[PDB]
């Protein structure tokens, strides 16, 4: 990549990382000790913005005979960083050290033999990551609202609630606890963006007035410039799956004052401000003050 630290998983930062892992070439001898010294040292920065949460390492190898029990004892000896090991491809190498890395480091060993098992295997690390949340009891049952995304059944722009469900059979005796560490599933009820627009009437204002609300990320929930189309990532080339995340500063013209208001609105404050601005016209051909 061109990134040398942990970057947020935007729609743009996730395209630079998918155009560079689509270009790599295979050459040279393998060295797990150097590789895992990089991973454990990149999850130690704390200089940059980080989620400060589940810290996983996702190894993509074929096989080997190195256990790297020293690297896994210098950095990860308090069992703070999980290690998920994937053994991709059809081959004959010893998948022994690889299975040992996952168990000793609170992870899981996944096998991807062919291209048909890619979609079912690279989605189950959310069952391991859900173990510390299932055992937390009724303190993780919090409704969470997703970013604005296009519905699968064609309906427009919607946001969805969320509440996980727990396998709690045999909870009267609390004796099995063998499969009760996994969630039964996740629910959701969609709230269309048009429904929110009914609660913000605008016809008592002039056409220059409007409402808008943002996430604790800058992404707008409703805005006059938010259109029901997926956002772009670059120049297209010819030879509902992604959310519609449009930042507030990229929805209208950017100033120095507007950044101050955006930061205050993210924090959760209240206030007012009056200031001359350059507002782009609807036809995208004029600008006034």
């Amino acid at each position: 990549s061109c990134f040398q630290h942990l970057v947020q998983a935007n729609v743009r930062n996730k395209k630079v990382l998918k155009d560079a892992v689509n270009n790599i070439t295979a050459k040279g001898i393998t060295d797990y000790k150097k590789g895992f010294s990089f991973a454990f040292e990149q999850l130690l920065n704390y200089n940059v913005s980080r989620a400060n949460c589940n810290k996983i390492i996702m190894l993509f190898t074929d096989g080997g005979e190195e256990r790297a029990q020293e690297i896994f004892n210098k950095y990860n000896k308090d069992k703070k960083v999980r290690v998920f090991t994937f053994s991709v491809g059809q081959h004959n190498y010893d998948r022994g050290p690889i299975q040992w890395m996952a168990c000793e480091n609170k992870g899981y060993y996944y096998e991807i033999p062919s291209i048909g098992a890619i979609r079912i295997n690279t989605q189950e690390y959310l069952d391991v990551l859900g173990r510390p949340m299932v055992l937390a009891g009724d303190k993780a049952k919090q409704v969470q609202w997703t970013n604005v995304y296009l519905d699968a059944l064609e309906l427009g722009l919607v946001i969805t609630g969320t509440l996980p469900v727990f396998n709690i059979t045999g909870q009267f005796e609390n004796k099995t606890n063998l499969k009760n560490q996994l969630i039964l599933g996740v629910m959701g009820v969609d709230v269309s963006l048009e429904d929110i627009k009914r609660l913000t009437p605008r016809f008592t204002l002039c056409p220059n007035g409007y409402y808008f609300a943002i996430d604790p990320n800058g992404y707008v929930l409703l805005h006059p410039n938010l259109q029901p189309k997926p956002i772009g990532v670059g120049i297209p080339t010819i030879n509902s799956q992604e959310p519609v995340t449009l930042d507030f500063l990229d929805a209208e013209l950017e100033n120095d004052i507007k950044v101050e208001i955006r930061n205050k609105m993210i924090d959760g404050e209240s206030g007012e401000k009056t200031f001359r601005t350059l507002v782009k016209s609807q036809d995208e051909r004029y600008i006034d003050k």
Binding site: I235, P236, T237, I238, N239
Partner: peptide, 6 residues
């Protein structure tokens, strides 16, 4: 926008 060529 319509695609390009490469």
């Amino acid at each position: 926008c319509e695609p390009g060529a490469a």
